[PDB]
Design a protein around this ligand. Structure first.
Ligand SMILES: CCC1=C(C)/C(=C/C2=NC(=C\c3[nH]c(/C=C4\NC(=O)[C@H](C)[C@H]4CC)c(C)c3CCC(=O)O)/C(CCC(=O)O)=C2C)NC1=O
Ligand SMILES: CCC1=C(C)/C(=C/C2=NC(=C\c3[nH]c(/C=C4\NC(=O)[C@H](C)[C@H]4CC)c(C)c3CCC(=O)O)/C(CCC(=O)O)=C2C)NC1=O
Ligand SMILES: CCC1=C(C)/C(=C/C2=NC(=C\c3[nH]c(/C=C4\NC(=O)[C@H](C)[C@H]4CC)c(C)c3CCC(=O)O)/C(CCC(=O)O)=C2C)NC1=O
Ligand SMILES: CCC1=C(C)/C(=C/C2=NC(=C\c3[nH]c(/C=C4\NC(=O)[C@H](C)[C@H]4CC)c(C)c3CCC(=O)O)/C(CCC(=O)O)=C2C)NC1=O
Ligand SMILES: CCC1=C(C)/C(=C/C2=NC(=C\c3[nH]c(/C=C4\NC(=O)[C@H](C)[C@H]4CC)c(C)c3CCC(=O)O)/C(CCC(=O)O)=C2C)NC1=O
Ligand SMILES: CCC1=C(C)/C(=C/C2=NC(=C\c3[nH]c(/C=C4\NC(=O)[C@H](C)[C@H]4CC)c(C)c3CCC(=O)O)/C(CCC(=O)O)=C2C)NC1=O
Ligand SMILES: CCC1=C(C)/C(=C/C2=NC(=C\c3[nH]c(/C=C4\NC(=O)[C@H](C)[C@H]4CC)c(C)c3CCC(=O)O)/C(CCC(=O)O)=C2C)NC1=O
Ligand SMILES: CCC1=C(C)/C(=C/C2=NC(=C\c3[nH]c(/C=C4\NC(=O)[C@H](C)[C@H]4CC)c(C)c3CCC(=O)O)/C(CCC(=O)O)=C2C)NC1=O
Lengths: 159, 160, 241, 65, 159, 160, 160, 160, 159, 160
């Protein structure tokens, strides 16, 4: 969020306006809660990928069906690896406080990648929704709100 | 007993008033009570998931659930789930009290007598409490997982 | 699939005979409860209840132990049914027979366990439950002791008014299983010595030095005092040793 | 000094599947100092107390019960 | 059935009433038919587990579906092993003549076990119903009635 | 436990199905149950006569019923008749079950503790159980008297 | 009591031996016991379906299950199912005994006292027992449905 | 029951959600709970002094404590003190609940039956409860003494 | 919560201990937030039943399927009426502060009622979970936590 | 003691001469002594290989040999090998004697006291003795492996 304000005041010839300094000071204050939320999502990763695969393959069985992409153990392992990647990028966005280092690695060219891989993007969005539900069950209320923030950004991005 | 009640008792049996070291102890307890309450809430959230994950980590697919093992009969499996739920619940009570005396008074009193009477394996119970401790330290975070693991290791050490 | 649940060992005779009794004793699902659900005009189904009550509340029997047998008015009020089974157990506990079987050769400490084994079906739970019953045996008779024993909301929420007590195998309280098995495995008049005299208070092995963010808080807050505390003017905060 | 009481117990907490007819309604005699805690226990379950009657005892007598 | 009458007359102070002796004599008479029924269910076990898995996975495909518990070869092998266990307990109850040594090992705590394993109990009841149908096809009429007796007890117990 | 329940348990703790040896054991039990039931009926006929004849054979006109003996007081004579009726009744139960486990579970559990606590003579009890065994083996016949004497000698051997 | 036990009692209180009219009564009972046992078996088959169909016929979608009615609370719905299962089970016992005395001794003893104490509507109970009777007379046939309806109408008449 | 629980019940039996009149009732209860708690504390302070002052006002030096009266025997004086302590304690519970249903459920249920069985004078009891009400309305103030006197007059009116 | 402390201190012969008076004073303080949460769930009921039926019939289609119970317009109207009942009891439990007046009307005998109605209880639990999700979207964070409290009690009770 | 010495003792304490049942027991022992001696020879061949294979089957690559386990320190590994060699050697002695009394007299006397004093895990010891039994039953054959497994299971059952 510091790079955001820095390039924001850098396109202008002005310095960083002190309201931006206030938002940086407030983010610096909230960084400890951000780090605890990121560590709580860090250590419990395989539970979240398990419950996300659970809720997704209960929701959409066509990836399980042989016409779909995630058919067989190798393809379903690649599917849960993709969900692991997106959980990792969500933890990066939780620490960074703003969605730039997660959009730069997971969002900015995802539609043409998944189009030329054959997979549907709506099933990936449902998988990140299942990750958001499982992390909402894993965390407290003020933690699940702040995690569902960036999970919500990913779900809106994949659609 | 509490940590508050233990501090008051230790000041009482001397006839001592509340000196500054006891006030330091009470103020440290009043500082740590925040994460104590938050940890107790999220452990009360999903206790069944913790017990399920712990038996899937430690006890399942062993010889213990095979015939001949102590968890073969389905009433014995239900008794196993009951004992693990007891360990987690009383560890939650000892974490929120900040004093392990309720574990000594309500759980660890005549428990080795019972487990040697019934033929319950003690080492598998210790490993199950260890798996409980790892699962809840992952679930709650490291900072409250330390205090949860202290009382779960207290149960494990008194059991052995 | 015929491999995930076959054992690969042999289990010959002592291992075959120990895994038979690899848990709680067999008497749990065999102590048949006695319930007064027959009706008023029955004179036969209540005979088994009366002998069953004598078998539970007295240890052995009352046939070779009383000469001119009492409770005949009690048995009559049972058969007619102006008296519940709980008041019949009251009349059994009140009688000077039971006073001569269990109160007279046994002390005031041991009668609490021998009196909660008979009526409530299980040993006393912790020390305070021994303290209250000892005060009732202190300034009141046994005729008030078993009275306050049976009128608790533990007798009438578990056994109920029309059942006789049956031997419970309690689970939830601390050391309420093995004290009860130590009480009930002994036969009648086997050891004069007191089974559970009291509850020895045990000390903890962690007082407050561990629990290491109560302990981290001791430190962090002890060092919170001497760091500049910026709330009041700065000039008063350079002159503090 | 005994009382003849007719009383009813609600049994609200669990759905008993046995006979359990005697307990809901009964006509029993209870002694003098015992009817106190019986009163209290019957009121704990919200039970209706239909009729309290003297079985044994003359009221107003002081010695000899 | 002898332990039943013995603890039944043992709670009372009376002896075994001779009507109970008549029922023990009649069970002693029928024991040969009981042993033949138990051996016929014994030697044909793998057929019964095969047809039970057949009729169950045709009836309920969610255990086959990846959100269900019996997904994959290992989990479906554990499923057919559970059905093998229940057939074994049914043969024990056929020999013993009364449902005590089968309820003591398979019924008395099964709901909390299957609840903390994640599996639904209704699918297990349908599996024992499929076992009852296959054993009804395997046996004669008076044998299938007396087997469907204890199979019926298990189906009522799992619900 | 039964002989049926013991066979089922021994087949169960291995995870074994009912093989042909267990079916042989159950069919032998189903063959012997006829005389088992007939013997239990005629022992339930005249148990008081058996106990009377046994004390008249072994214990009466000794020093045991004289003053100084353990059967001098009339409550002690009634307790003696009660103990002998217990031995005969539980031996009848163990004969009809075909398995001596109920003797181990209900009679022989804490009995030497009681008889050494009260000062009850053990050898006179063993001789009284022997006289019980001779009287009921005469009364029931040799063929069921063998199985009755097996469990009565089991009580006598565990008592010593 | 039985029909056998009632015949024996009626012959006993006179000191009369078993004359030919009592033997006619016992032989009629031994003739009817076939369909008695078959009816009791198929009623024990699907008692829950009978109770479900009876409440769907009579009690459901009325004001009784609406708020203000006596079956509004879900514990009261469970108590209603329990009472109807009791009526069907004790009617099965009275059908197999062939004598309604167990209904008088175990069900109809203090039941109007209880139903007027709790405020239970009596007429809706009578109509529910009527719907039970129609469902089981359809399910078992007319020939055993007559004897089932006799004891169910006995419960209905004693309730009113 | 509460005033909260009564409001929830009255909204429940209609199937109605919490409308604004029920929210007014609950907010009035949440306004009055301050003086409710303070009144309950100071009544729990000196209940024995209130009962002593009430018997000194109404019952003492009459014919009731003279021989022939119902409070002559010392066990009857102790029973009188017990009954007055009961009236004050249950009136405190009904004051803090804000709903007199616990008086109807626990005190006033079978009390006239008992007092006419024992020959207890009812009018002297009513005057004693009146003296209790005057003493506690003096002790607590007028503003909470009104609500205390409402439930004490409820006991007095149901007793008569 | 006042009846809870009153019968709690009433089983004992002691008065109400002043820690219980502290918890009653704190509940009296929080009653205004409780009333606002209950009114917010009150006025928006039909949205919550609509989204609960949405998420349930998307999650479990067997009630929609003709073998299930909620087949046809009349049965699906009875289904949404049941969800309306449970939302009403949740508002009662939100006002009362403790789960007694909601368990007394909706929990204490629900398993045998739904068993003798034919409906599965797990679908009802999923319906109350959908109600909890929709009310979590409707409320703020500290309000959704305190509503998901009693919704969580109902979901645990129906299982 | 022996099987010979046990037979002689059982004949001696009665004052009985050697009757035909005792001669049957001694002749059965003299029949089985052939394979007893051959089994003892081939077990004395490669006892170290049996202990090595047993720890490689059961105890190795677990947490027990990891730090924190009871076999982490190398003196504790050597003590583990010593205890397993003791179990195998005394089981060989009890197999050749044909009587488990030397196990009761020399091994199983105060062993649970020692293993609960040192904190030795009992269940891992039982599984190690089980792996010993499987390895020597494979090595010696089934016919002598039965008698070897009887005394090894005797040690395992007395240990638990
Ligand atoms: C961190 C940024 C990042 C992303 C986003 C990423 C996606 C990614 N997904 C892939 C495959 C895949 N991705 C999926 C996806 C799914 N299964 C489904 O049914 C759903 C539609 C979805 C997940 C629930 C599947 C099935 C494959 C294998 C497809 C194939 O083999 O052709 C592959 C090719 C195989 C590989 O090298 O892993 C890439 C590179 N890689 C990355 O480094
Ligand atoms: C609050 C403290 C507390 C505990 C722990 C407690 C335990 C306890 N566990 C028991 C049985 C049992 N306990 C176990 C537990 C185990 N066996 C294993 O193999 C595993 C290693 C372990 C589970 C992790 C089993 C299997 C039984 C069944 C024995 C039987 O009932 O047959 C019993 C016998 C009666 C009964 O369960 O209802 C008690 C009293 N009571 C208490 O008051
Ligand atoms: C201390 C005062 C007192 C009395 C009197 C009393 C009587 C009494 N007599 C009863 C029965 C009986 N009472 C009698 C007595 C008689 N019938 C006759 O024909 C004769 C005229 C008379 C004998 C002289 C009989 C025959 C029964 C048996 C009814 C039955 O149990 O079936 C019963 C029913 C239950 C039972 O005996 O055990 C009671 C309670 N209870 C008491 O507490
Ligand atoms: C003889 C008494 C007895 C019973 C009843 C028993 C049940 C039992 N079922 C298990 C697993 C299992 N049970 C099932 C069950 C099923 N598949 C389904 O979809 C249906 C719901 C059902 C059978 C058709 C499944 C899928 C697993 C594996 C679950 C897992 O790995 O978490 C396990 C844990 C793994 C194991 O050690 O076998 C036990 C102990 N064990 C026993 O010793
Ligand atoms: C079901 C198994 C079982 C047995 C056997 C049993 C025995 C038993 N025998 C007792 C006393 C007794 N037991 C005996 C018996 C004997 N003394 C002799 O001289 C003879 C050798 C022998 C009789 C054959 C006597 C004389 C007493 C009386 C001691 C006394 O009460 O003063 C007592 C003391 C209390 C009482 O009788 O009521 C018990 C508990 N309890 C049991 O639960
Ligand atoms: C074996 C003979 C027998 C019967 C019948 C019996 C009935 C009986 N029904 C009761 C309650 C009840 N009974 C009913 C039944 C009904 N109300 C209606 O609206 C319908 C007309 C009718 C159902 C068809 C209900 C709704 C209650 C609940 C009252 C309450 O518990 O709050 C109670 C109060 C306590 C409890 O259920 O557990 C008893 C004792 N007891 C017996 O021993
Ligand atoms: C919680 C509601 C409640 C009440 C009130 C209650 C009253 C009650 N009062 C009793 C006796 C009594 N009650 C009184 C009271 C009075 N007589 C007078 O003259 C005065 C007017 C009045 C005192 C103000 C007396 C004097 C007795 C003694 C009668 C006796 O025991 O001989 C008894 C008989 C047994 C016993 O005290 O232990 C009961 C049950 N029980 C209850 O559960
Ligand atoms: C406030 C306390 C309360 C509860 C809990 C309650 C339940 C209740 N649910 C009913 C029916 C029903 N309940 C459902 C339930 C469902 N649809 C499904 O598929 C799911 C399993 C579930 C909801 C999502 C269905 C489908 C019916 C109609 C069943 C039939 O007509 O047989 C009925 C009978 C019809 C009626 O009178 O409404 C009652 C009494 N009533 C109450 O007063």
């Amino acid at each position: 969020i510091v790079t955001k304000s820095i390039v924001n005041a850098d396109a202008e010839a002005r310095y960083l306006s002190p309201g931006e300094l206030d938002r940086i000071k407030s983010f610096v204050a909230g960084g400890q809660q951000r780090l605890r939320i990121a560590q709580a999502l860090t250590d419990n990763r395989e539970r979240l990928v398990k419950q996300a695969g659970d809720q997704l393959f209960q929701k959409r069985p066509d990836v399980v069906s042989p016409g779909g992409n995630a058919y067989g153990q190798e393809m379903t392992a690649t599917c849960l690896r993709d969900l692991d990647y997106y959980l990792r990028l969500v933890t990066y966005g939780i620490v960074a406080g703003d969605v730039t280092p997660i959009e730069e690695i997971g969002v900015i060219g995802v539609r043409e990648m998944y189009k030329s891989l054959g997979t549907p993007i709506e099933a990936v969005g449902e998988g990140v929704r299942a990750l958001k539900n499982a992390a909402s069950t894993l965390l407290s209320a003020e933690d699940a709100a702040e995690a569902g923030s960036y999970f919500d950004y990913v779900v809106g991005a994949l659609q | 007993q509490d940590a508050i009640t233990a501090v008051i008792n230790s000041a009482d049996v001397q006839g001592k008033y509340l000196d500054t070291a006891a006030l330091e102890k009470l103020k440290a307890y009043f500082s740590t009570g925040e994460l104590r309450v938050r940890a107790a809430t999220t452990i009360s959230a999903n206790a069944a998931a913790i017990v399920k994950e712990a038996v899937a980590k430690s006890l399942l697919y062993s010889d213990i659930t095979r015939p001949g093992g102590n968890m073969y009969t389905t009433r014995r499996y239900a008794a196993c789930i009951r004992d693990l739920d007891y360990y987690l619940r009383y560890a939650t009570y000892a974490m929120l009290a900040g004093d392990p005396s309720i574990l000594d008074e309500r759980v660890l009193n005549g428990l080795k007598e019972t487990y040697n009477s019934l033929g319950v394996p003690v080492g598998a119970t210790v490993q199950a409490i260890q798996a409980i401790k790892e699962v809840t330290a992952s679930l709650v975070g490291a900072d409250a997982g330390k205090e949860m693991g202290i009382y779960l290791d207290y149960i494990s050490s008194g059991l052995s | 699939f015929v491999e995930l649940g076959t054992v690969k060992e042999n289990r010959t005779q002592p291992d075959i005979d120990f895994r038979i009794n690899q848990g709680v004793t067999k008497q749990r699902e065999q102590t048949k409860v006695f319930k007064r659900v027959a009706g008023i005009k029955d004179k036969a189904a209540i005979k088994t209840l009366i002998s069953a009550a004598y078998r539970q509340i007295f240890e052995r029997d009352i046939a070779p132990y009383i000469a001119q047998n009492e409770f005949s008015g009690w048995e009559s009020k049972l058969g007619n049914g102006e008296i519940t089974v709980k008041e019949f157990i009251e009349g059994l506990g009140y009688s000077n027979l039971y006073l001569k079987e269990f109160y007279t050769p046994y002390p005031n400490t041991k009668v609490i366990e021998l009196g909660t084994k008979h009526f409530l079906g299980r040993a006393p739970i912790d020390q305070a439950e021994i303290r209250k019953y000892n005060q009732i045996l202190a300034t009141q008779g046994i005729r008030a002791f078993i009275n306050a024993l049976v009128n608790s909301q533990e007798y009438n929420e578990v056994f109920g008014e029309d059942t006789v007590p049956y031997r419970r195998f309690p689970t939830l309280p601390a050391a309420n299983f093995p004290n009860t098995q130590k009480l009930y495995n002994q036969l009648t008049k086997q050891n004069n010595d007191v089974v559970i005299p009291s509850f020895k208070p045990v000390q903890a092995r962690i007082q407050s030095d561990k629990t290491p963010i109560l302990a981290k808080a001791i430190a962090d807050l002890a060092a919170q005092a001497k760091q500049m505390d910026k709330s009041k003017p700065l000039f008063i905060e350079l002159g503090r040793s | 000094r005994l009382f003849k009481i007719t009383a009813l117990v609600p049994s609200l907490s669990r759905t008993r599947t046995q006979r359990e007819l005697q307990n809901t309604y009964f006509t029993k005699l209870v002694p003098y100092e015992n009817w106190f805690r019986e009163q209290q226990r019957i009121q704990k379950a919200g039970g209706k107390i239909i009729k309290v009657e003297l079985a044994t005892g003359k009221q107003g007598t002081n010695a000899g019960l």
